[PDB]
Write a protein that binds this DNA or RNA. Structure first.
Lengths: 149, 185, 129, 83, 83
RNA sequence: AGCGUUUACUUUGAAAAAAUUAGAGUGUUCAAAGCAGGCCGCCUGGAUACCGCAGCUAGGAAUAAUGGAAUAGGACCGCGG
């Protein structure tokens, strides 16, 4: 079940058996890569790029049409963001909560939810440190967390 | 000819005859635009169950998709030339041995037995892509891989099932049965 | 979380056999489960089974014959030396006639009687009688 | 019931079951060629879009995103496509 | 059930349920021994031979005696395979 | 003669004080013991097994960790140095 909640949600994507590409799709490997570049250049994360592609163009996976995954494509061309786009969203969330908590000091619930979010930041940050996609110096501390976008 | 054999050795009279037949087909037919830089690696000929025979061709893995594009249009006039036989293209995958304790980089997981054998079966049934697999473990101990093939190209390739079963039993040494399901597409 | 996969697979067979079901779908298929079930089949406690490939961990459908009293697992995988295989097969199995301790050795996954014959100790997986 | 073929279930059972709990999981969604009456052209839209898909050069809105499936605009011929 | 020599030693051999393949205990009083009559093919009349089935106590009170008798009969070809 | 990602695991071998325990022989008159004895000068004996763990050694490669190219300082192949 959920890491920081009592919920037991069974609701995710279910890829088809067939890893093959469909007949109707006329977009090629390089055509999709060219559009992946343009979407990311406009200012867009690997989650949003994959959504915009398969809603409008009809690209079940980039991995099946092309050879590689979206971030893997981006960080080859050199368009990939510095810290990952899931640790980014967790930090930005922690900033928004902590700013709201600055004014509303009597909010004991916001205080408790900040502890769960910052606990989840610490937990994911060290995974990335072992895999070496963060410098081992890297330290999330709230005072110099607002400056990290 | 158009056969670039991997070892600097002799494309034997059998493999030569097919490489020359492909040069002639090029020079005569319309799809000579494609057959400029496409090549053969080798070409054996097996005896399939019954009283039938299946000529088999090998391809450089890079230019496989280039063959795949024209594979069904080409195989027709190969079978019209070599009358009472079946023909099917397969890519020559390199296969590295499991690195034992006794004794050069990390073996990529495409250069391994299970992945190569999965890729061999993928290319056997080219026009009809695979939609299912069931490995029946029989009571003696032996296995039986049961492949469900896409119901499009059923009528086109249902007569090649024993060819595919025989070719795969030869290349790998595993017993396979190709079925056509009615309940998905 | 799902720590042990063989533990789940053998509890699933055991529950289905008691309830009197004729076949059971044990989910997270692995080399260790298949190699366990081949041994179990070769002595003739289960029937023929069919392993179902989705591009993930596979599934297994085991055709059940009503001749399986218990199929259990030992966790952790204790390191059974050859001389101590007596005291193990003494306190796990019903009698000295029938029942098997299957243990993973140097050679491969095989029952106590085979491992005794081949002159190999190894790590215990489970038992079936 | 003791005897049920878990290997060969009839397709009404699998279409009933949750997408993850079928004998081999498969998506409940699909792709469909949708065209507005004015223009000549057919644009691929995903069943569960979750973005406002536009006809080329901002001609008009084509589908509206909801909780589950996307509301296609009133006056649009959709043909769900198969592979 | 015989010794080293080969002499069958136990004082009787219990029956096994046709559905579950359990041994029917010496005092399993809800166990049945049901003879379904065998019929001449051309006339549709009783021959004087029968296709006998045994079922365990647990199976009956489970409520699977009906389907198990049915499936045994349909396997023998007493009930039509079409059904 | 020299080699060969590492370790845990299992099997073999080496080295392991006697006494004690298990145990082969032997009518202490039987036995507990004892290491004696037996044959009409001679023939025997004073065995063997166990001694966790750690260290040492040589086979096995299932299971369980760990490692190898991804701003390519990649392996191999040869020339220029």
């Amino acid at each position: 079940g959920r890491m920081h909640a009592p919920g037991k949600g069974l609701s995710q994507s279910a890829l088809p058996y067939r890893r093959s590409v469909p007949t109707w799709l006329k977009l090629t490997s390089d055509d999709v890569k060219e559009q992946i570049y343009k979407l990311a250049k406009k200012g867009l994360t690997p989650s949003q790029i994959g959504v915009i592609l398969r809603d409008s163009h009809g690209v079940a996976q980039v991995r099946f049409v092309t050879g590689n995954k979206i971030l893997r494509i981006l960080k080859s061309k050199g368009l990939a963001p510095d810290l990952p786009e899931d640790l980014y969203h967790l930090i930005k969330k922690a900033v928004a909560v902590r700013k709201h908590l600055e004014r509303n000091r009597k909010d004991k619930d916001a205080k408790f939810r900040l502890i769960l979010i910052e606990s989840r930041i610490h937990r994911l940050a060290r995974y990335y440190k072992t895999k070496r996609v963060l410098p081992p110096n890297w330290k999330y501390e709230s005072s110099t967390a607002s400056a990290l976008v | 000819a158009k056969i670039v054999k991997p070892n600097g050795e002799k494309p034997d009279e059998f493999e030569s005859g097919i490489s020359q037949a492909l040069l002639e087909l090029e020079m005569n037919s319309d799809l000579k635009a494609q057959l400029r830089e496409l090549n053969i690696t080798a070409a054996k000929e097996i005896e399939v169950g019954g009283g039938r025979k299946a000529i088999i061709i090998f391809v450089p893995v890079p230019q496989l998709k280039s063959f795949q594009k024209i594979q069904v249009r080409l195989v027709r006039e190969l079978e019209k030339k070599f009358s009472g036989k079946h023909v099917v293209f397969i890519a020559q995958r390199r296969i590295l041995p499991k690195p034992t304790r006794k004794s050069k980089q990390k073996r990529p997981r495409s250069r391994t037995l299970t992945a190569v054998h999965d890729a061999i079966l993928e290319d056997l049934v080219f026009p009809s892509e695979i939609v299912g697999k069931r490995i029946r473990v029989k009571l003696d101990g032996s296995r039986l891989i049961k492949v469900h093939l896409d119901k499009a190209q059923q009528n086109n390739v249902e007569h090649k099932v024993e060819t595919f079963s025989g070719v795969y039993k030869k290349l790998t040494g595993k017993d396979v049965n190709f079925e056509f399901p009615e309940f998905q597409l | 979380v799902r720590m042990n996969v063989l533990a789940d697979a053998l509890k699933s067979i055991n529950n289905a056999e008691k309830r009197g079901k004729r076949q059971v779908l044990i989910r997270p298929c692995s080399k260790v489960i298949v190699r366990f079930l081949t041994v179990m089949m070769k002595h003739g406690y289960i029937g023929e089974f069919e392993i179902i490939d989705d591009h993930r961990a596979g599934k297994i459908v085991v055709n059940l014959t009503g001749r399986l009293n218990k199929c259990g697992v030992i966790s952790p995988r204790f390191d059974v030396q050859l001389k101590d295989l007596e005291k193990w097969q003494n306190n796990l199995l019903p009698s000295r006639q029938f029942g098997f301790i299957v243990l993973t050795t140097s050679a491969g996954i095989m029952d106590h009687e085979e491992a005794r014959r081949k002159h190999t100790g190894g790590k215990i997986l489970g038992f079936f009688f | 019931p003791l005897a049920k073929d878990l290997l060969h279930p009839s397709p009404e059972e699998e279409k009933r079951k949750h997408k993850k709990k079928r004998l081999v999981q498969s998506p409940n969604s699909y792709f469909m060629d949708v065209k507005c009456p004015g223009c000549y052209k057919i644009t691929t839209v995903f069943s569960h879009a979750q973005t406002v898909v536009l006809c080329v050069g901002c001609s008009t809105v084509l589908c509206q995103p909801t909780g589950g499936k996307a509301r296609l605009t009133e006056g649009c011929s959709f043909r769900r496509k198969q592979h | 059930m015989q010794s080293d020599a080969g002499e069958f030693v136990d004082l009787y051999v219990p029956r096994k349920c046709s559905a579950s393949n359990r041994i029917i205990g010496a005092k399993d009083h809800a166990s049945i021994q049901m003879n379904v009559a065998e019929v001449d093919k051309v006339t549709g009349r009783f021959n004087g031979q029968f296709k006998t089935y045994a079922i365990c106590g647990a199976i009956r009170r489970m409520g699977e005696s009906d389907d198990s008798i049915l499936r045994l009969a349909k396997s023998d070809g007493i009930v039509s395979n079409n059904f």
